[PDB]
Amino acid sequence: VYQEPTDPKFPQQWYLSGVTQRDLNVKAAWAQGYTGHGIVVSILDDGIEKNHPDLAGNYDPGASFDVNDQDPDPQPRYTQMNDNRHGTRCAGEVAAVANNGVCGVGVAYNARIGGVRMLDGEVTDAVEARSLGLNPNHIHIYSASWGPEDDGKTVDGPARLAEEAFFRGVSQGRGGLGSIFVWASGNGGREHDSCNCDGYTNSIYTLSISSATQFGNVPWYSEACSSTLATTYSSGNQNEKQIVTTDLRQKCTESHTGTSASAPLAAGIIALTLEANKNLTWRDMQHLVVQTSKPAHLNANDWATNGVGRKVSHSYGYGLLDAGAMVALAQNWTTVAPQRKCIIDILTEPKDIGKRLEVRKTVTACLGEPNHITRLEHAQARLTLSYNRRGDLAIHLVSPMGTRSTLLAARPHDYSADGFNDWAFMTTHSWDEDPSGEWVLEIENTSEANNYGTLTKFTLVLYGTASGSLVP
Ligand SMILES: [Ca+2]
Ligand SMILES: [Cl-]
Ligand code: NA
Ligand code: NA
Ligand code: NA
Ligand code: NA
Ligand code: NA
Ligand code: NA
Ligand code: NA
Numbered sequence: 201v202y203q204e205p206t207d208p209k210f211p212q213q214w215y216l217s218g219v220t221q222r223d224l225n226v227k228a229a230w231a232q233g234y235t236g237h238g239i240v241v242s243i244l245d246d247g248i249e250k251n252h253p254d255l256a257g258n259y260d261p262g263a264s265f266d267v268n269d270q271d272p273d274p275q276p277r278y279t280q281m282n283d284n285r286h287g288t289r290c291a292g293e294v295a296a297v298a299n300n301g302v303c304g305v306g307v308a309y310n311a312r313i314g315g316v317r318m319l320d321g322e323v324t325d326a327v328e329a330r331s332l333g334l335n336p337n338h339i340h341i342y343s344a345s346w347g348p349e350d351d352g353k354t355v356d357g358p359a360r361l362a363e364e365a366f367f368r369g370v371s372q373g374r375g376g377l378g379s380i381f382v383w384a385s386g387n388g389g390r391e392h393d394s395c396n397c398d399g400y401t402n403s404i405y406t407l408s409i410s411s412a413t414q415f416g417n418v419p420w421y422s423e424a425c426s427s428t429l430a431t432t433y434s435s436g437n438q439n440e441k442q443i444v445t446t447d448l449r450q451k452c453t454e455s456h457t458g459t460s461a462s463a464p465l466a467a468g469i470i471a472l473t474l475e476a477n478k479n480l481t482w483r484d485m486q487h488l489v490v491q492t493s494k495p496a497h498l499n500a501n502d503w504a505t506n507g508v509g510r511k512v513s514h515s516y517g518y519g520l521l522d523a524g525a526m527v528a529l530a531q532n533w534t535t536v537a538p539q540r541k542c543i544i545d546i547l548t549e550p551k552d553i554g555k556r557l558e559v560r561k562t563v564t565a566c567l568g569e570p571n572h573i574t575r576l577e578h579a580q581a582r583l584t585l586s587y588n589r590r591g592d593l594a595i596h597l598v599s600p601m602g603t604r605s606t607l608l609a610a611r612p613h614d615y616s617a618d619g620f621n622d623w624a625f626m627t628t629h630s631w632d633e634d635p636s637g638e639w640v641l642e643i644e645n646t647s648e649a650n651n652y653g654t655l656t657k658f659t660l661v662l663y664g665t666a667s668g669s670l671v672p
Pocket of ligand 5: 345346
């Protein structure tokens, strides 16, 4: 009979286990015998306190490096401000030791945990690449919340070395099964940011996670976008509890916060899942998340049912992660077929945007070809356009099954005149839909200003397979 952890702060870890059912259902996974044994997770951040009394027992130097100083030791740089505590906080979320009379427990409290010190210095493309590409046949799961500053006016993603690291990771990482890159969707809610403008979370190669408050609401810091897959609990207002974890200087904290605290919890759940089936590919893991995640009691004004009957939100993706359901579905999971990629160049001539532009196109999704797709995974609308004030644009994409994805919401602080240069807006909301038929792209000026510009390229890129569907 499974006995839950006795750690002093475990009762404060409301998101792990509750009578309330406002939790991630992690205890059910533990009771099935999955606690993360044999799985390796790395926190890509500001370092890890490897001698922390609640981390030392699970610490793995093979999951660690210091890319800022170019040496193996990921110890945080100690300062009066305690600036470099974040990675240590995230590590504890994943893999804090259980039943040791110290603090709380990790989601995967028998997993091995390391950290990369890479944010404490100048973060170049090369630094990002070397962090993403750290020991990819030892580390199973990476967790990160970096990328562009979420100031609501930036459009930025991985440069060439980092993008190459992503493709190398998912292709040859983890014995060919693919590195699992878990990402926080962003924290620019206050600046009205729209997270598809962040190429790291907008990537198909990252498994992107947003936040819900304890009372099941969309936190002030949250960013909505179509690229997000799912949600874990994090902080909210001052009546709502927060994340309880390991802190710098061998301390315990009850006030870890933000979307950056949601990603590590997801990484821990994904570790439990990988323990339940070590053969899951990077794409398998995303399927599991889509199928098992739970909308219930998450409050949003944009819940919509897609073409295969699943509820999806731009704030929450497919909903709250469910660890028990993940590990259950993982055990007899059949590996998905090889990924197909159908490239459809939509325009025959450039199109004036004006006040509103609608582009309709009926596609066959590579019928008759080896990239024929009847089961969609990710879809991208890769857009090249000029515009005089970028943040006034809102962009939507409607699938043949009638699923309306917001690719871009108005960003009031984005006054850029640089437009978009083949930016690959991505949506997860049409997952498992048949993409044959009429797609609709909508671009609109949300302001009353006389704005102007031209859409010069629209590539619809479809990823997925042609086999093995479930009944909706
Ligand atoms: Ca502990
Ligand atoms: Cl590709
Ligand atoms: Na170091
Ligand atoms: Na970020
Ligand atoms: Na960040
Ligand atoms: Na960049
Ligand atoms: Na591969
Ligand atoms: Na992503
Ligand atoms: Na169709």
